[PDB]
Amino acid sequence: SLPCDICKDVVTAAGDMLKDNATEEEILVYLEKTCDWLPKPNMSASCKEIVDSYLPVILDIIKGEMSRPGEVCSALNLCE
Ligand SMILES: CCCCCCCCCCCC[N+](C)(C)[O-]
Ligand SMILES: CCCCCCCCCCCC[N+](C)(C)[O-]
Ligand SMILES: CCCCCCCCCCCC[N+](C)(C)[O-]
Ligand SMILES: CCCCCCCCCCCC[N+](C)(C)[O-]
Ligand SMILES: CCCCCCCCCCCC[N+](C)(C)[O-]
Ligand SMILES: CCCCCCCCCCCC[N+](C)(C)[O-]
Ligand SMILES: CCCCCCCCCCCC[N+](C)(C)[O-]
Ligand SMILES: CCCCCCCCCCCC[N+](C)(C)[O-]
Ligand SMILES: CCCCCCCCCCCC[N+](C)(C)[O-]
Ligand SMILES: CCCCCCCCCCCC[N+](C)(C)[O-]
Ligand SMILES: CCCCCCCCCCCC[N+](C)(C)[O-]
Ligand SMILES: CCCCCCCCCCCC[N+](C)(C)[O-]
Ligand SMILES: CCCCCCCCCCCC[N+](C)(C)[O-]
Ligand SMILES: CCCCCCCCCCCC[N+](C)(C)[O-]
Ligand SMILES: CCCCCCCCCCCC[N+](C)(C)[O-]
Ligand SMILES: CCCCCCCCCCCC[N+](C)(C)[O-]
Ligand SMILES: CCCCCCCCCCCC[N+](C)(C)[O-]
Ligand SMILES: CCCCCCCCCCCC[N+](C)(C)[O-]
Ligand SMILES: CCCCCCCCCCCC[N+](C)(C)[O-]
Ligand SMILES: CCCCCCCCCCCC[N+](C)(C)[O-]
Ligand SMILES: CCCCCCCCCCCC[N+](C)(C)[O-]
Ligand SMILES: CCCCCCCCCCCC[N+](C)(C)[O-]
Ligand SMILES: CCCCCCCCCCCC[N+](C)(C)[O-]
Ligand SMILES: CCCCCCCCCCCC[N+](C)(C)[O-]
Ligand SMILES: CCCCCCCCCCCC[N+](C)(C)[O-]
Ligand SMILES: CCCCCCCCCCCC[N+](C)(C)[O-]
Ligand SMILES: CCCCCCCCCCCC[N+](C)(C)[O-]
Ligand SMILES: CCCCCCCCCCCC[N+](C)(C)[O-]
Structure with missing residues (x-):
């Protein structure tokens, strides 16, 4: 079905993006920066x-x- 082909292509594209060797690093830096909202040095370090x-x-x-x-x-009821 079209909704199925579309849904499976989108999930594939998502998977490929996540397989990218820089993606996990980008996310890690972003989340570590978030930990910096916490007091330092100990709480932020525990969060990281x-x-x-x-x-x-x-x-x-x-x-x-x-x-x-x-x-x-x-x-999602898009493929049956
Ligand atoms: C995970 C990505 C999903 C992309 C697929 C797009 C959903 C197709 C919409 C089907 C439902 C439309 N409707 C209500 C008329 O049946
Ligand atoms: C009328 C526009 C023609 C195509 C519209 C529907 C395409 C949905 C987008 C597919 C998602 C692209 N993708 C899989 C690379 O992420
Ligand atoms: C019901 C409309 C179907 C569209 C499903 C959503 C597609 C995800 C969009 C990701 C962007 C990919 N791209 C190449 C089209 O830009
Ligand atoms: C379940 C689908 C959820 C993903 C929705 C996000 C779509 C990302 C595509 C953004 C592209 C917008 N624009 C104007 C820059 O092309
Ligand atoms: C469960 C999958 C839902 C995630 C939807 C978001 C689509 C991510 C695909 C992005 C692909 C990059 N692109 C083609 C826009 O440049
Ligand atoms: C793409 C945004 C997040 C959606 C993908 C998350 C996967 C949901 C998995 C829940 C169940 C998986 N499990 C543990 C049974 O294997
Ligand atoms: C949700 C499952 C994992 C994939 C997350 C999809 C959201 C990312 C789409 C944004 C496109 C990325 N980019 C290169 C335009 O920045
Ligand atoms: C079902 C999990 C997917 C949720 C994440 C989708 C978010 C896509 C955000 C991309 C925004 C692109 N831009 C440049 C217009 O901001
Ligand atoms: C949107 C992300 C959803 C992720 C859901 C998956 C559940 C997390 C698995 C628990 C971690 C496993 N454990 C026991 C080693 O901690
Ligand atoms: C569902 C887990 C979280 C997904 C969030 C991923 C968004 C990454 C932002 C785009 C960066 C990916 N890439 C390939 C361009 O480096
Ligand atoms: C598994 C948890 C996912 C939620 C984290 C959201 C990831 C954000 C990555 C985007 C990076 C922002 N930017 C533009 C500097 O690359
Ligand atoms: C559980 C899914 C997590 C949601 C993922 C959030 C993705 C945010 C997209 C930020 C990337 C946009 N851009 C172009 C600034 O990099
Ligand atoms: C950025 C990710 C945030 C950390 C997520 C923490 C998940 C802890 C899950 C503990 C569950 C232990 N379990 C499954 C045996 O009950
Ligand atoms: C904050 C990210 C979400 C991770 C939380 C998931 C809860 C994990 C604890 C229950 C898992 C039970 N089990 C047997 C499926 O592993
Ligand atoms: C348990 C899932 C992870 C939740 C992530 C929440 C992060 C959103 C806060 C924005 C952080 C923005 N910045 C620029 C400080 O990196
Ligand atoms: C551990 C994974 C979650 C990453 C996000 C860390 C949560 C810290 C954000 C709380 C903000 C602290 N404060 C006082 C500025 O609100
Ligand atoms: C599991 C916890 C995930 C939630 C993390 C988001 C924290 C939101 C608080 C932002 C406040 C930051 N600031 C500098 C404006 O105070
Ligand atoms: C585990 C689900 C929680 C993830 C969502 C938490 C995001 C909080 C973002 C608040 C950002 C506040 N501010 C003004 C600094 O941008
Ligand atoms: C050294 C700082 C003193 C308290 C630090 C820990 C407090 C964590 C923040 C609690 C969350 C606030 N809340 C529940 C209203 O969202
Ligand atoms: C390990 C540190 C404990 C902090 C847990 C995360 C608290 C969520 C922050 C929400 C923001 C609420 N407030 C009032 C503190 O800004
Ligand atoms: C859903 C919001 C969670 C806020 C609670 C903060 C988590 C407390 C951290 C406990 C783990 C610290 N550690 C690794 C030293 O055990
Ligand atoms: C503000 C830092 C808290 C991160 C938010 C994600 C949920 C807290 C899970 C902490 C898990 C700690 N531990 C070792 C008990 O699994
Ligand atoms: C995109 C938002 C996430 C919603 C997707 C959840 C999947 C629902 C289909 C399986 C549910 C099965 N059951 C019996 C627990 O209802
Ligand atoms: C936005 C995307 C919706 C994510 C839906 C996740 C479906 C989970 C399927 C559960 C099947 C369990 N298992 C281990 C066989 O994967
Ligand atoms: C903004 C929310 C996006 C729509 C989420 C769609 C969820 C559809 C779940 C269908 C699952 C049907 N089911 C449980 C009987 O299999
Ligand atoms: C955007 C969040 C989507 C996460 C929804 C995960 C749906 C799981 C479906 C329930 C089936 C249970 N199990 C263990 C077979 O996966
Ligand atoms: C982060 C949001 C996660 C939401 C996970 C809950 C599963 C969605 C329930 C499916 C909707 C029920 N139904 C069959 C009426 O479509
Ligand atoms: C681009 C629109 C698609 C929204 C992304 C959320 C997943 C699609 C779920 C559509 C559900 C349609 N239906 C009626 C089959 O459940």
């Missing part, structure tokens, strides 16, 4: 340690999901 540890964990989950564009698109 949680980001550094968990961002690649969360990224991996998303990328895994984008690797199955049919499944994603079925969950």
